[PDB]
Structures are given as C-alpha cells and as structure tokens.
C-alpha cells in the first residue's frame, strides 16, 4: 500500500504546499463565477419565444356541412334524433363544426307562414334538438345552424319584400343563441339588397353575445372584386364562395389564384372551399380528387367540406339521384332502389379498412391539421418551380416545418425547387423526411433529397424538416 501516517504527514506536508493549496481554491472559485456569468450571457442572447395568437374554435380544424338530413342518414331514420348516433363517425373525421341544414318550416314562397323560431315537425322539436346540442358538446363538436329563410323555394330571401324578412332573421339571432347554438350561416346573399349592410348588423348580435360565436356567409360569385366588396367592412366573417371552382389545369393558374387572394386581403383568416353548398365531385374529375384534399388541409385558413367529400361521393355515378342531395353510402344496404349498384370501395365501410382509400387519406390529413402548430397558425410562403406545379411552405417560429409540392400536369415533370427568395428563418435543407403521398410507390419516413425530385402525373406529396441553425 501507499499510506504515510496521520502524524508523519503534518510534519512533511505544508512547507510551501500551504500556498499552492490556496491557489487552487481561488482558481476554482474564479472559474465558477466565470461559468455563472457565461450562462447569463448566453440566456439573454437567445432570441425570444413568439407569442401564440388567440385562436378560436374554428381556427383549429375543418367544418362539415350537412345540407339534407334525410339523405345523410337514409329515410328509415331521418330525424334530428337519428343524427345523435352518427357523432362517433364525425369524431373519427376530427371535424369541429356541424353546419346542419335549415329546419325552420318554410312554406314554399309564403312570408306570412315562415317562422324561423319553430322547428319543422319532420325533423323533431326543441326536446331532441337540445339533446343533440348536449351530446355534441361532450365530443367537442360545435353546432352551426343556418337560417336561409326560403330554402325550399326557387329564390331565397323572399324576393317579394326586403326588410320584413330581414327583421325575421334578426329576431332569430337572439333566440337560437339563447338555446346554445355556436354559430350561424346565411347562403345565397347575392339575392339580397343591402347585402353588405345586413351582414354588419348580424355580426354585431353574434359577437355581442360572445366572442366564440361565428357567422358564415355564402355567395356564388367567382370574381375577386365582388368578394372584396363584402369583406371591406366585415373582417371576422367567413365567406364561402366559388372562387376556386375554375379548372386549374395548369399549376400556376391555381398558384396565382391563391396568392392574389391573400395579397389583396392582407393575409387575414380566410375560408378555403370549392363551393358554398356543393360537393367536390362537381367541378373536378376523380383523378384530381386527392390532390385537392391535400391542398385544402395545408392552406392558411379554415377548410369547409360537404358531406360525402371524404369518400368521394359522386352524385352522377348512381342514376336517379338529385344532384343537390345525394344519399350517403354507409353500407351496401344504403341504396336499395337499384340492387347491386354500389361496390365496396365506394362506401364508408369498405374504405374504413382500406389503407389506400380516400377516407384513409382524409383521416391522415385531418389529424395533422389539428395538432401541428405550423399548420394551425403558421406562416405561408409560396415559391416558384418548373413549368406547371404548385409549391409552398408552412412554418411557425421553432416548430417543425412543412413543404407541399403539387403537380397538376399530366407528364412526369421534375420539381426543380429553388430556395432563392425564401426567408432565411425557414429556408429548405438538402434532405427532407417524407410524410405521405397521394399515390403509392414511395417509402414513408425516408430522407430524400430535394435537388433531384422527379414527380408523377397528378401526384402531391407532403414533406417535413426541422428547425435548423
């Protein structure tokens, strides 16, 4: 061993070791304050967190319009009571809004017999309407009731008179807000006189009750100046129009159509839709149908869909259907009029287990719209690419970025993305992780390089890359 001696040490230790034992305690203590002062400098030189905006409930997720209750469920259980059983399927879609059709006993172009305070007996009454509002609140799903008064006549808003039916809606704003609905919608407001003046009066009563109440207005005008004339006085108004309902057969037509709306409205919160009361199989073929669901879930704003847009329900596929209200294909027993006319991949039950169906892509895009922070309120920055295609980036302060590349052409075009005029906060790296694609044939989770990105026809893919220094 190597032990000296308790008594031998103190006569051989510290002749001049007493000075080198104090020079190490002082050097320890000066290096501990130079370490503490060096950590305050690094902490205050860190940039800051960016403040999270005050999000409402319609900012986080998508809305779901149910125009016809009898055709959404089938005639065998067509009521407000049968709608309560379908709240589990709508919770699987992760939708937040329940814009359900008007139920207020219109009498086919008669102003004197149209009471917007009384429910039509073919749907129910206030006893099972209140049961629907309570059971939907448990699953965090808000109910929006629309009050277009002449909803079963040829022209809405009762074209024989103007302000008797305007005060009819104004009494119904304060009555249904007492019962606990969470919003309102008015359609076909191009058939109004003083349309831009009545929307400001109705949004007063909606926001004066509470700030968590919504008002939606719908037109059919597809031009930019008629839309901006309604939104120059109103700002917290969702306006569902037919603005994107053109062809878009080239990519820079839809790129210039989106980036002109956000430039003219000053990057406010907007609504993204193909129509106001109509499905996606109108205006679109079936091969551009998954490409438009990826775009509507990754644009800055609220996406609004009709019922039967997650399964790709075509109204012209089955004969003998009204195009304004087709039946919902729940099972193979959902259309018993013509036997053996519907398949298994054309149905909710068959697409629910298929991992490459349209309902599976809808659920895989709806969950990431509702939880990723740079898709909820991230910034938007589109950039240029090849001959025809659309590319953009969604980014927030320090969360994970997203990159969407959409090919609207018909040949195997290469991407050719340049990062020149992107901001240096969220410029793109050399490799990005793939998250999904609309067509199969790519391995998901693979870091693939963005310098050589060849793309298929009608192909859209979603990438993501982290915040780097």
């Amino acid at each position: 061993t190597g032990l000296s001696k308790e008594e031998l040490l103190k006569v051989a230790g510290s002749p001049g070791w007493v000075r080198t034992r104090w020079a190490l305690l002082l050097l320890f203590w000066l290096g501990w304050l130079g370490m503490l002062a060096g950590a305050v400098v690094i902490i205050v030189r860190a940039p800051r967190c960016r403040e999270l905006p005050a999000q409402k409930w319609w900012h986080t997720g998508a809305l779901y319009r149910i125009g016809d209750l009898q055709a959404f469920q089938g005639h065998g259980a067509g009521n407000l009571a049968g709608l309560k059983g379908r709240l589990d399927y709508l919770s699987s879609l992760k939708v937040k809004g329940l814009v359900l059709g008007p139920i207020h006993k219109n009498q086919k172009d008669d102003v004197a017999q149209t009471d917007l305070l009384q429910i039509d007996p073919n749907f129910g009454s206030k006893e099972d309407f209140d049961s629907l509002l309570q059971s939907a609140k448990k699953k965090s799903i808000r109910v929006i009731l629309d009050l277009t008064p002449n909803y079963r006549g040829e022209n809405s808003w009762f074209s024989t008179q103007v302000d008797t039916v305007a005060t009819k809606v104004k009494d119904a704003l304060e009555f249904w807000l007492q019962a606990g609905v969470d919003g309102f919608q008015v359609r076909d407001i191009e058939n109004l006189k003083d349309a831009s003046s009545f929307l400001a009066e109705w949004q007063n009563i909606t926001k004066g009750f509470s700030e968590d109440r919504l008002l939606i207005a719908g037109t059919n005008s597809s031009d930019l100046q008629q839309i901006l004339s309604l939104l120059e006085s109103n700002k917290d108004l969702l306006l569902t129009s037919s603005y994107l309902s053109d062809s878009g057969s080239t990519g820079e037509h839809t790129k210039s159509l989106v980036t002109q709306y956000l430039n003219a409205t000053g990057n406010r919160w907007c609504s993204w839709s193909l129509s106001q009361a109509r499905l996606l199989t109108s205006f679109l073929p079936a091969q551009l149908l998954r490409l438009y669901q990826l775009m509507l879930f990754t644009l800055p704003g609220t996406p609004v869909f009709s019922y039967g847009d997650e399964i790709g329900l075509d109204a012209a596929a089955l004969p003998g259907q009204p195009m304004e209200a087709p039946v919902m294909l729940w099972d193979e027993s959902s259309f018993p009029d013509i036997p053996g006319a519907v398949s298994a991949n054309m149905t909710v039950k068959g697409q629910s287990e298929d991992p490459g169906s349209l309902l599976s892509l809808f659920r895989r895009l709806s969950d990431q719209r509702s939880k990723e922070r740079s898709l909820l309120h991230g910034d938007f920055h589109a950039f240029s690419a090849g001959p025809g295609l659309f590319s953009y980036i969604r980014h927030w302060d320090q969360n994970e970025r997203f990159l969407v590349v959409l090919n609207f052409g018909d040949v195997g075009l290469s991407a050719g993305l340049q990062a020149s005029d992107l901001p240096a906060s969220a410029s793109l790296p050399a490799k990005a992780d793939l998250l999904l694609s609309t067509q199969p044939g790519r391995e998901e989770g693979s870091p693939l390089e963005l310098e050589r990105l060849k793309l298929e026809p009608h192909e859209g893919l979603l990438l993501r890359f982290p915040y780097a220094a």
Binding site: G2, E6, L9, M35, I42, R50, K371, D397
Partner: protein, 458 residues
Amino acid sequence: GLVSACGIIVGNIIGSGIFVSPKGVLENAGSVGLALIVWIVTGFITVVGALCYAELGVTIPKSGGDYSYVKDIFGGLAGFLRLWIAVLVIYPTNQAVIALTFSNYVLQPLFPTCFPPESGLRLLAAICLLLLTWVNCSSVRWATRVQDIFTAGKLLALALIIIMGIVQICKGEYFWLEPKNAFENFQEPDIGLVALAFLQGSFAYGGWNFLNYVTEELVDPYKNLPRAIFISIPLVTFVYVFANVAYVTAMSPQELLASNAVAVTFGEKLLGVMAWIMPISVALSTFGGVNGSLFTSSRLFFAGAREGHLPSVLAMIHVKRCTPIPALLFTCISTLLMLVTSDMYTLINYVGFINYLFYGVTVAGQIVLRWKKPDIPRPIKINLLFPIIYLLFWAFLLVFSLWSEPVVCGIGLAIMLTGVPVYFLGVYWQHKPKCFSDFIELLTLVSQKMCVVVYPEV
C-alpha cells in the same frame, strides 16, 4: 419502531423521478390507460426485488450491499464488475440526469413555447454539480443539515400536485382519465417499446437496493423488516399513480409530450400564483437528489478499497473534517463527462438497462444459495416461487431492450467487458513490475499532500 422505519423507506425512494419519467413512460406506451399499467407493475416488481435483497441481508450479514453478495457467490471476477459499473456508469449518470432536470425546470418560464439554448442547459447543470461537490468536500455536517431544506421542497411540490388533482376530479375535468374510452393511440410501436417504458418507470423507483440493509437500527427485525416492505413501497406506488392521473386532468397527452418540464406546465394551468411556486420547489427537489447521491457514492469506494480492488488513494478521509475528497473528486469529473454529451432521455435508458442486468445477478445468486449450501440459518425465508417471477420479467426485458435500442444498450455492455482485462492487470498480477508499482506510490503521495487527506483507522 415499524412506523418510524416505514418513513425512512418512503423518503429514500420518492425523489426527482416523478418530474421526468412521466413523459418517457407515455411517449413509449402510446395510450394513457396503458401507461398507468406500467406504474403499477413497476411498483409490484420493486416489491418482489426488495424482498430478495432482504433475505440476502440476514443470510450473509455484510456491509456494501449488493457488491458483497456477488463476491460471496461468483466471487472473483463478478464482484469487481458490480463495482466497476457502479462507479463508472451508475452513479455518474444518475447524477447527470438530475442535474439536467434542474436546468430544464428553471428555463421553462423563460422560453415557454420554444427551445432554450442547448449550450446554456449544459452550462447550468455544471454549476449545480460543482457547487454541491464543494459543499460535500468540506464539512460533512453542512450537507446533512442542508438536505432538510431540499426535502421540504419535494414535499411542498408533491402536495400541490395531489390536492389540485382531486379538485379537478370534483369538477367535470375527468375527460381523459376516468372515462375509460380515451385508450387509443399509436399501436405500430412494438412490445419492444413497452419494454422501454419499464426502464423509464424504474428510474423513479431507484434507491431500493442500497437502502434496506442500513435500517439496522430497526427494532426486532426478522419480522419488522419484511413487514416494512409491504407498507412503504405500495404507498410510493399510490403517490406515483395519483400524481400521474393529476397530470392528464390539467392538460392533454399531446400537450404533455410537447413540454420539457411537466410540473410547471401543470402550474401554468390551475392557478396564477403557481407559475412561480412550481419551478422553485422542483429545483429545490433536484438539489437534494444530487446532494443525496454524493453521500452514498463514497460508501462504495470505502468497501472496494479494503478488498484489494480500487486503489488506496481513494477511500481516504481528511484529517480535520471526515470527508473523502479524492472519492468526491472522482465521481464529479465522470459526471461532467456524461453531461456535455448525450441527450437526457437516452441517458435514462442507458442507466436503466445496466441496473437490471445486475438486479438479476444477485436475485439468481439468491437461488443458487439454496441449491448450493443449504442448512445455513435463514431467519427470513421467502417462497421459492417469488424470485422466479422476477427472473421471468428480467429475461423478457433485457432481450426486448437490446432489440429496441441496440446502440444505447450495446455500448453499456462494452464498458463491462472493458472491466475484464483491467481486472487481471489490477488484481491477478504478480508484483514484480517495480517500474510501475512505484508510480502508484508517486501518485498517492502527491495526492496525499495536495489535500491533507489520510487513510482511516480501520
């Protein structure tokens, strides 16, 4: 006698584990209701493992704990590897995880949604470690009297999580926990990711192995020591379950996995004054986890040096204050190395795998002490079917952790197999190299003069 001994075992198991593991036990199990199964099975496995240590503590009455049990069974090489891992891997990385917890909790109110600087997290964890080493190298009476102020920090923080959890139970805020229908998440995680959540739940239960052989002061044991295991450990499991159901009443499970410090995201909700009182009480809790880990780290340098291993410049004490400086300077340098590197959740995994590898050696060593060498006096006798349930859960957890994380679990076995050649040049050497044996004499005498340390009287 029994009621004062139960509080010794409760105060030594409950530490800073309930403020870090919750996030790793969830991100692995997927579901919320499945994560609460892990917190009950881990509290049952720790009871079974601590009754096999209480039988070895009265069969071979030794000081040193689990290090001396592997020197009576598999005596030469396997006892050194218990010591080799416990001073290089176990104690340096248990201290580096609690020090990284302290910097994560004081830098959450600043930067509440973005990331704090990663170079300022390491720098702040090296300040906590270097200060408490100075408190421990001087004045053994100081570090004992200051660890009562750190104890009240952990009790004030835990009392606020529990009684604010039952307030929201007396509300409608039981949406995720009580309803028993929110039990669905990512199922593509394997069984191999369920075995990773048992490694991270057992970090909160650490401190049971080197514990119940010191409670000697206990009155009539052989009846009061096995009774204290059945009381004090399932009460730690009740606190760890009641504090985990209280986390999900205040936030969503996607909100918990986004946080870096769960107890202060709890405090940003549920009042407006506990945005101040939550980072204070948890940072006080982590000061006592590091200070309490620097007492017991030097007890194993004492037992190793009087056995032939672990050379005699360690296990020396200062002449005026009976404090081991070169055993405290050794466990502080190796903690700084395991800091300015690894992540923080990967480290937990790293330490949890090499803990269970030696939890099974001493429990299997308890079985072979019944086959080999019967007819020895055993005052405590547990049933033989009791350590087999431990060894079945042991085998199903080491084979599924190597399959999940091969690079974290495989480098831990490389340090243990590094101990095999250094044992033969260290203990099994003929003492003819005088050209190198005097280098030990040179380093011991210089270290005995740069501090005023000396070997003890025994």
